[PDB]
């Protein structure tokens, strides 16, 4: 059989129990609104040097399209920065950053969630970005995935 | 050392900085605040459509009750799309012979000016004591887009995004949940929303 | 046309009253002196208030 | 008189807002609900 590290990586266990009220609440929200059925989410952060402009909006929209295209991992994306009504909440006070919350397949800790986080990072990083704009995938699920990866390392 | 013992739940403190999660956290904390990266979600579900002003009043009451809780920075929802009250929503905002007639016309314009001053004063101070959304505003596409994000397709439930003050992954951050649930339950009391189901979720 | 505008404004005021009644809002309160003379409050004030 | 009725309704609201109290009825709330056509916006 393979090494213990690989087997442990491919047989991870979700950190939260199913009976946990928080997980139940998140799944209830997902199923009621008919958007998703997971319980783990990550927040992609677009940081810019100068205040973000229209080209930043175009890049953001293209990235959102790419995310929503991949139905395997990404289940639902709420583009608050995209709509003008809620655009104030997403963008920072200085106007040099903006974040979008993305739901990934699989619950936190579980290997499926780690794979989904890796796919999200790949999508957010591989695309050519406007000069001065950088993408960073952060959040609780990303932190859990990094924790497991560093322990195994 | 027993009395001073305490625990924290933020795993970014237990990792090297070079990891991608720590880098993203560093960027976000440079620009945003910490609580925004780990928000909360609350869903109040009923059995009837809430896409009408009468239920909007109760929804805004619930939002105010949630925000007034200690340690909660801002709450955004269908009645507060960007965390601030919707503009032009306060009640005060809603509030020879020819020569004689013209003077009354001039007086009316001055009274019209007076009402504008009060509206601007209430808008600038972000007052939120009173609230009313006229039925016409429900027809505008701006609220059509909003109601498809913060409300279910059948309109039986509405989601709230709750953002803490400071780091939300501390002991107090985990202890604020019961206060929020109690506040929501008390806000619902006495309204047609009685009998609803409340779900609280998020990292905390 | 000004008369029609007044009626439309009158309709608008009714909608707000109906919304506040349906929502059972209780933030503000005022009972006009005339309503005190109605027999409905006369019966009530003899039950919940001393003679 | 209305002036004291304002204070009475304030007391009733303060009592109802207390945790664990379902409904409070009084001269300003004969059936446990606010009297219809009593809100200021109604007058407006």
UniProtKB/TrEMBL annotation, chain A:
It is found in: Cell membrane. Signal peptide: none annotated. It comes from the Bacteria. Belongs to the resistance-nodulation-cell division (RND) (TC 2.A.6) family. MmpL subfamily. This is MmpL5 protein. It comes from Mycolicibacterium smegmatis (strain ATCC 700084 / mc(2)155) (Mycobacterium smegmatis). The chain holds residues 52 to 204 of 967 of the full protein.
């Amino acid at each position: 059989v393979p090494t213990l590290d690989e087997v442990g990586e491919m047989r991870a266990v979700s950190m939260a129990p199913n009976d946990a009220p928080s997980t139940l609440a998140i799944k209830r929200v997902g199923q009621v609104f008919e958007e998703y059925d997971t319980s783990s989410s990550v927040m992609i952060v677009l940081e810019g040097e100068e205040p973000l402009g229209i080209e930043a909006h175009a890049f953001y929209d293209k990235m959102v399209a790419d995310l929503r295209a991949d139905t395997e991992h990404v289940q639902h994306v709420q583009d608050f920065w995209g709509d003008t009504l809620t655009a104030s909440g997403a963008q920072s006070v200085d106007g040099k950053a903006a974040y979008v919350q993305v739901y990934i397949a699989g619950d936190q800790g579980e290997s499926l969630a780690n794979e989904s986080v890796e796919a999200v990072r790949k999508i957010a990083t591989e695309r050519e970005t406007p000069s001065g704009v950088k993408a960073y995938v952060t959040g609780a699920a990303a932190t859990s995935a990094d924790q497991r990866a560093e322990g195994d390392a | 050392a027993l009395p001073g013992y305490y625990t924290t739940y933020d795993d970014r403190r237990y990792l090297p900085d070079d990891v991608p999660a720590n880098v993203g956290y560093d960027a976000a904390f440079r620009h945003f605040s910490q609580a925004k990266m780990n928000p909360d979600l609350m869903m109040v579900e009923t059995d009837r459509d809430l896409r009408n002003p009468a239920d909007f009043l109760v929804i805004d009451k619930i939002a105010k009750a949630l925000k007034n809780v200690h340690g909660i920075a801002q709450v955004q929802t269908i009645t507060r799309p960007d965390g601030d009250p919707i503009e032009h929503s306060t009640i005060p905002y809603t509030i020879n012979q020819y020569q004689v007639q013209k003077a009354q016309q001039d007086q009316n314009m001055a009274m019209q000016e007076n009402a504008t001053a009060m509206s601007q004063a209430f808008d600038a101070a972000k007052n939120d004591d009173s609230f009313y959304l006229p039925p016409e505003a429900f027809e505008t596409d701006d609220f059509q887009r909003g109601m498809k994000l913060f409300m279910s397709p059948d309109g039986h439930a509405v989601r709230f995004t709750i953002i803490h003050q400071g780091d939300p992954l501390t002991e107090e951050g985990t202890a604020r949940m019961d206060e929020l649930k109690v506040a929501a339950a008390d806000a619902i009391k006495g309204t047609p929303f009685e009998g609803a189901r409340i779900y609280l979720g998020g990292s905390a």
